[PDB]
Coordinates of C-alpha atoms and ligand atoms in Angstrom, one line a residue:
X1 CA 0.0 0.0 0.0
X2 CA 2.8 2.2 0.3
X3 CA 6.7 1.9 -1.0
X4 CA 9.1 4.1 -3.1
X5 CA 8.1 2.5 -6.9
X6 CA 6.1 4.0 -9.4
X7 CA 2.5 3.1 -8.2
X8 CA 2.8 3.3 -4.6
X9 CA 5.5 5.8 -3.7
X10 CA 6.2 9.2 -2.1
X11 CA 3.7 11.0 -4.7
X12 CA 0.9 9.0 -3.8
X13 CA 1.0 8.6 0.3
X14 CA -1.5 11.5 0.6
X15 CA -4.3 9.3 -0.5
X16 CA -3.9 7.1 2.6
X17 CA -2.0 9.9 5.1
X18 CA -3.5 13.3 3.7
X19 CA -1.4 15.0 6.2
X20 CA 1.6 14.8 3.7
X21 CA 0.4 17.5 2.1
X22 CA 0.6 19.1 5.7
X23 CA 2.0 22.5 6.9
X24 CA 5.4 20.4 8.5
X25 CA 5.9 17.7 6.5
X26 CA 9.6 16.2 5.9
X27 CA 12.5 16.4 4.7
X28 CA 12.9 19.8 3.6
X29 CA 16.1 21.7 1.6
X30 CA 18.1 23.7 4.0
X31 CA 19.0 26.7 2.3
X32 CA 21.9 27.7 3.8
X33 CA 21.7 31.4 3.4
X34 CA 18.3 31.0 4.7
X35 CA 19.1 29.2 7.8
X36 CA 19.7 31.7 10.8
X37 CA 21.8 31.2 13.6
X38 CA 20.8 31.2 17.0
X39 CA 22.9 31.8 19.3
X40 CA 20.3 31.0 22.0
X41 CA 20.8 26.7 21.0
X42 CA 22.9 25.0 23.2
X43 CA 25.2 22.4 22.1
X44 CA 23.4 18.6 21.2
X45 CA 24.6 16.4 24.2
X46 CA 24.7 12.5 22.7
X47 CA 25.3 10.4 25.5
X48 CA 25.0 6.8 23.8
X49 CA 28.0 5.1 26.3
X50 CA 24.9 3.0 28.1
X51 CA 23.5 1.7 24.7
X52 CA 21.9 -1.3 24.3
X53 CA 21.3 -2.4 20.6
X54 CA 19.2 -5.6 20.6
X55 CA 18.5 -6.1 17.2
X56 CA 18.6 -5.8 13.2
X57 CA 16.1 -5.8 11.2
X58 CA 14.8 -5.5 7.0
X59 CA 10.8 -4.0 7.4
X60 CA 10.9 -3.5 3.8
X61 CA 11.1 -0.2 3.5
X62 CA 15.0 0.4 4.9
X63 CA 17.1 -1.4 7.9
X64 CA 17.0 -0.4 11.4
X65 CA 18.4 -1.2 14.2
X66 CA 16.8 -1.4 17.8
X67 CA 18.1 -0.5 20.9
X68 CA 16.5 -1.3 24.8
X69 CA 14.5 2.2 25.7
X70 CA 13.0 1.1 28.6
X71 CA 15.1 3.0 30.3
X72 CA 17.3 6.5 30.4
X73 CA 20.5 4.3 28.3
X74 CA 21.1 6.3 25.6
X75 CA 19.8 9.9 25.2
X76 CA 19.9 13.1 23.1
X77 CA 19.1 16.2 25.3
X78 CA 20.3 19.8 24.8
X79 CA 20.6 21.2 21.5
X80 CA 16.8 22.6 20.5
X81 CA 15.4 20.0 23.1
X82 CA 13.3 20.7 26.5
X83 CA 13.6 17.2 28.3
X84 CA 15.2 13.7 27.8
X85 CA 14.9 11.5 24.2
X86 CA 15.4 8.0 24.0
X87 CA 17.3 6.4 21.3
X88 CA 15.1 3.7 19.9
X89 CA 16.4 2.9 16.6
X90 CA 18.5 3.7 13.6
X91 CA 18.5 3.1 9.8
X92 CA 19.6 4.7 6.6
X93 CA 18.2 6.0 3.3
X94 CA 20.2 5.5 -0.1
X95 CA 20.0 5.7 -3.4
X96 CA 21.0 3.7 -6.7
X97 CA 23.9 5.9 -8.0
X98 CA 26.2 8.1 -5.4
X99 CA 24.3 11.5 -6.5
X100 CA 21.2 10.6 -4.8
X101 CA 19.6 8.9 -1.8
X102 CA 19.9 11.5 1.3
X103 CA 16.1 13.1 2.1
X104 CA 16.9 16.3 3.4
X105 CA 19.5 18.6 1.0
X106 CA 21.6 21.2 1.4
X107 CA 21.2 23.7 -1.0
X108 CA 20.1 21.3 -3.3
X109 CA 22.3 19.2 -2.9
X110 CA 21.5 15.2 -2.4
X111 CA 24.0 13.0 -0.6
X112 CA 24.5 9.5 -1.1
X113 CA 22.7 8.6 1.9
X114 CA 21.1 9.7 5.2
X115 CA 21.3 7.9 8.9
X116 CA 18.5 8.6 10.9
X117 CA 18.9 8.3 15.2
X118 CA 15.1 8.2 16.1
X119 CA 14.6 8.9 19.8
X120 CA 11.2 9.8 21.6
X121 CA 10.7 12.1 24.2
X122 CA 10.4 10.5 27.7
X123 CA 7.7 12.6 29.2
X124 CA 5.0 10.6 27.4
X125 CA 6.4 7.6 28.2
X126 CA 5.9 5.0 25.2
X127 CA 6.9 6.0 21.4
X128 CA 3.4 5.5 20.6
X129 CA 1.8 8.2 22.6
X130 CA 5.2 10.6 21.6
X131 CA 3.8 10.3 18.2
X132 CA 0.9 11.7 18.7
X133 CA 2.4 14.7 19.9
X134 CA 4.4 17.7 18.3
X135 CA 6.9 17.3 20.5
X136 CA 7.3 14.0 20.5
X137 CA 10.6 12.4 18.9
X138 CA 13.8 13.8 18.0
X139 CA 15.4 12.7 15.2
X140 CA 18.9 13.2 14.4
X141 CA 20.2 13.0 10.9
X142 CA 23.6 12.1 9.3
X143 CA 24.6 12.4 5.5
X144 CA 26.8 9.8 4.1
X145 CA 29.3 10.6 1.2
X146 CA 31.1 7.9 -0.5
X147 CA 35.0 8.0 0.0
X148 CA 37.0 6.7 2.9
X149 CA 35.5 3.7 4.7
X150 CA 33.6 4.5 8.5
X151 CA 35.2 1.9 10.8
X152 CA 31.7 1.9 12.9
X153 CA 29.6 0.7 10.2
X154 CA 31.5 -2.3 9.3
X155 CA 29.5 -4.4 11.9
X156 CA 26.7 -3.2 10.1
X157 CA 27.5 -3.9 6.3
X158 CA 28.8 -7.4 7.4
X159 CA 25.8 -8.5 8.8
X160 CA 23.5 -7.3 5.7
X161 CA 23.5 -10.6 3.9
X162 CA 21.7 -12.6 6.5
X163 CA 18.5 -10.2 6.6
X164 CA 18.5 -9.7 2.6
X165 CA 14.2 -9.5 2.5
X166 CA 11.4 -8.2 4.0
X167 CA 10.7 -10.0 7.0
X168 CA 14.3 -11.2 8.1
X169 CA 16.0 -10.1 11.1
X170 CA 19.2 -11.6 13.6
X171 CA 21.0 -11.0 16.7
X172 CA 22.9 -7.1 16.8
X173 CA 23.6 -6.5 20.0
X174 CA 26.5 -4.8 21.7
X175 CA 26.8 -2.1 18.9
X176 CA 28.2 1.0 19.6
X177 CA 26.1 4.2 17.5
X178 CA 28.9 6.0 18.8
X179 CA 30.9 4.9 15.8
X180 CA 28.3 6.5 13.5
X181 CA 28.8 10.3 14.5
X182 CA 30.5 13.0 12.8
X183 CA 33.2 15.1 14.7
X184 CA 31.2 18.4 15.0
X185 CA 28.1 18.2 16.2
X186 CA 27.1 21.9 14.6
X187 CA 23.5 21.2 13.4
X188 CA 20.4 22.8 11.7
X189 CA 16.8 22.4 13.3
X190 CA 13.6 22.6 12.3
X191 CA 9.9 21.6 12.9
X192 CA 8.9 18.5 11.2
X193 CA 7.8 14.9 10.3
X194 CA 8.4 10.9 10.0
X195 CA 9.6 10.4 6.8
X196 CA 7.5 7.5 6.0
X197 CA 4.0 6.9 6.5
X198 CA 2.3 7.9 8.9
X199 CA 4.0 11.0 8.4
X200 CA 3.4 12.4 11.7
X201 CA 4.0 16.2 12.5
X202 CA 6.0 14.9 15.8
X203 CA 9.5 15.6 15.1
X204 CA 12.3 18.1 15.7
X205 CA 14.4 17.5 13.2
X206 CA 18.5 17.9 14.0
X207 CA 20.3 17.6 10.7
X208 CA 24.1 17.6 11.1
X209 CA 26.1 20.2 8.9
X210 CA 29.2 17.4 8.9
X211 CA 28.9 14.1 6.8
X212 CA 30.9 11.0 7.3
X213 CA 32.0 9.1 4.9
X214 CA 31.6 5.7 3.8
X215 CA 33.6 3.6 1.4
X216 CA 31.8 2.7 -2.0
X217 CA 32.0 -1.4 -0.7
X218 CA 29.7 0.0 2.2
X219 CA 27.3 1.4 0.4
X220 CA 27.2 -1.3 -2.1
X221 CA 25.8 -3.7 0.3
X222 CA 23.0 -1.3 1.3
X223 CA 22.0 -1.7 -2.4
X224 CA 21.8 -5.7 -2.2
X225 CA 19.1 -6.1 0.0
X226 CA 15.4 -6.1 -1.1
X227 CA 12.3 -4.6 -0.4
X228 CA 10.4 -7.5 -1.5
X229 CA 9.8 -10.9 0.7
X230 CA 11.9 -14.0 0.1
X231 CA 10.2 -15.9 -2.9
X232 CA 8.9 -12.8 -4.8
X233 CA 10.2 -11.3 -7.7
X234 CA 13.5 -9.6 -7.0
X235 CA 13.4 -5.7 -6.6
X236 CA 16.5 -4.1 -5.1
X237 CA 16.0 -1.9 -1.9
X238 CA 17.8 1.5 -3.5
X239 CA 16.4 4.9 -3.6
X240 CA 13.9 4.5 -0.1
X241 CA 14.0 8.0 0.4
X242 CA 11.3 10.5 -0.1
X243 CA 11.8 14.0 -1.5
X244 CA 12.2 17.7 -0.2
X245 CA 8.6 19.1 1.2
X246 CA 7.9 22.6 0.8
X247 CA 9.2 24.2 4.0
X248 CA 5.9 26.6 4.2
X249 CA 5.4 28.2 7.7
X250 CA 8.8 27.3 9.2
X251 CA 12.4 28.9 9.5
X252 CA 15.4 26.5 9.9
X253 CA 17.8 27.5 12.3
X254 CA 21.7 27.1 12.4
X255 CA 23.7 26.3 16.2
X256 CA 27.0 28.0 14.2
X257 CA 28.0 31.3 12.5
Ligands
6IV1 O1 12.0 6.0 7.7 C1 11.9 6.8 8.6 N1 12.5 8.2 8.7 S1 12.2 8.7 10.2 O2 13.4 9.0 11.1 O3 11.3 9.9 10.0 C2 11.3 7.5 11.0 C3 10.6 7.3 12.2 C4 9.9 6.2 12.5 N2 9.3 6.0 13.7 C5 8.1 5.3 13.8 C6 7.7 5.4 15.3 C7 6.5 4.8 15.9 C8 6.8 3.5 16.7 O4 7.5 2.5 15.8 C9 8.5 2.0 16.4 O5 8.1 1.0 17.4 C10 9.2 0.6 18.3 C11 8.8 -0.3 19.4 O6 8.1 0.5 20.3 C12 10.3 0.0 17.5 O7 10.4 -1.4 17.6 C13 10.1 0.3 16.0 O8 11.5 0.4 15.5 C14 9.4 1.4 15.4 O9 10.4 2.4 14.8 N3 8.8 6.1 15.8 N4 9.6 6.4 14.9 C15 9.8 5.1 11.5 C16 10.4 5.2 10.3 C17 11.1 6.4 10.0
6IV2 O1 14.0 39.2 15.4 C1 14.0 38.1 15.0 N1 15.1 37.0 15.1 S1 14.5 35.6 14.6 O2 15.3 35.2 13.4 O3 14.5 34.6 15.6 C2 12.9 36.0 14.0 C3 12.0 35.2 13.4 C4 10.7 35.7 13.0 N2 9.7 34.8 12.4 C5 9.8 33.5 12.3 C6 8.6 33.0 11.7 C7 8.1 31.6 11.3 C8 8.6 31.1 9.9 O4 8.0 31.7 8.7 C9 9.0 32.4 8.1 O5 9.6 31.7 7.0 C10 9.3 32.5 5.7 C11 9.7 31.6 4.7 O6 9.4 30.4 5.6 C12 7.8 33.0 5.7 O7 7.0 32.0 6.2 C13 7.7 34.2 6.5 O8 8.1 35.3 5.7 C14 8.7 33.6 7.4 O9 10.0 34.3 7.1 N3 7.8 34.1 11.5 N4 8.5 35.2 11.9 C15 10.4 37.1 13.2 C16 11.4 37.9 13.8 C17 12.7 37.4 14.2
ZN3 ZN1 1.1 -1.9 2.2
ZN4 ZN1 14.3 7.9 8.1

């Protein structure tokens, strides 16, 4: 009822989630020139040291791994945040060819992929209920460029051939989304959405100005898994990202000069 082809992708989810055509739907461009710095946003403090990944998994849409939030492990606080966010889960967003695959932009510019650290606010207590709310989850967002290799996602990219479909998923734990960060931590924020249906206006978005970089046999085995079930005709899980929204009432803000 909803993927990324032709007949059931990104141009279509309004029929069964109208509120993509809503007033804070993402991802959006950041126009850089745009983007105003406020000197008012603290720095993001990522304190992942008590993480507890439990799983991997392919929900045919991307990959994600999960992590233990039933309790204060590993948090994002600070930055544009009031309170405490869980980390509940990570995946990516690629493309078929380096020049695409990232969901947000800079200028208009499209990197070969985009990490997503999804982590829900604590004072409503379940990710369900955070949600439903506009301040509900923070997500924090990576780009990936193709060059060197990243050391941290290795564990990842090895483990990719043993969840291949839709439906598969293994063992991941002690992973360390430490090893997934940028140096700088300098970021742009803005009010927004989930990505993916439902598309709920429940996010504040944290997009990091630095990408990391990841070696072309990295993201090469992103673009062997599938988006279909084992036993269906083959269709290769590339380009799961949904396009720049119009940015409508909202200014994105800059935590550097
Ligand atoms: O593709 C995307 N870009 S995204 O960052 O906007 C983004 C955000 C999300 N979220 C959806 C939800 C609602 C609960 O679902 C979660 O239930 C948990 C168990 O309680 C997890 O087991 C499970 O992993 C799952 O995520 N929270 N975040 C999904 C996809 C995308
Ligand atoms: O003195 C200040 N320092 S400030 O930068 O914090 C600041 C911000 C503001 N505003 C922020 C907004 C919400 C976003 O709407 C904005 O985005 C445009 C394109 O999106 C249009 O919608 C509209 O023209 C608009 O510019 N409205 N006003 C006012 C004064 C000051
Ligand atoms: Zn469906
Ligand atoms: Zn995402």
């Amino acid at each position: 009822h909803w993927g990324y082809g032709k007949h059931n992708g990104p141009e279509h989810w309004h029929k069964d989630f109208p509120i993509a055509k809503g007033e804070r739907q993402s991802p959006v461009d950041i126009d850089t020139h745009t983007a105003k710095y406020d000197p008012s946003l603290k720095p993001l403090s990522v304190s992942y040291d008590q993480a507890t990944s439990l799983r991997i998994l392919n929900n045919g849409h991307s990959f994600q791994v999960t992590f233990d939030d039933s309790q204060d492990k590993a948090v994002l606080k600070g930055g544009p945040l009031d309170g405490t966010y869980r980390l509940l889960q990570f995946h990516f967003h690629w493309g078929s060819l380096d020049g695409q695959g990232s969901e947000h932009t800079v200028d208009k510019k499209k990197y070969a992929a985009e990490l997503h650290l999804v982590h829900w606010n604590t004072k409503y207590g379940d990710v369900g209920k955070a949600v439903q709310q506009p301040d509900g989850l923070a997500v924090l967002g990576i780009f990936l460029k193709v060059g060197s290799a990243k050391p941290g996602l290795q564990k990842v990219v090895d483990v990719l051939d043993s969840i291949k479909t839709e439906g598969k998923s293994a063992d991941f734990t002690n992973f360390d989304p430490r090893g997934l960060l940028p140096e700088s931590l300098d970021y742009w924020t803005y009010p927004g959405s989930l990505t993916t249906p439902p598309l709920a206006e429940c996010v504040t978005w944290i997009v990091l100005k630095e990408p990391i970089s990841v070696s072309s046999e990295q993201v090469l085995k992103f673009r062997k898994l599938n988006f279909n079930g084992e036993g269906e005709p083959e269709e290769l899980m590339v380009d799961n990202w949904r396009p720049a929204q119009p940015l409508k009432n909202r200014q994105i803000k800059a935590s550097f000069k």
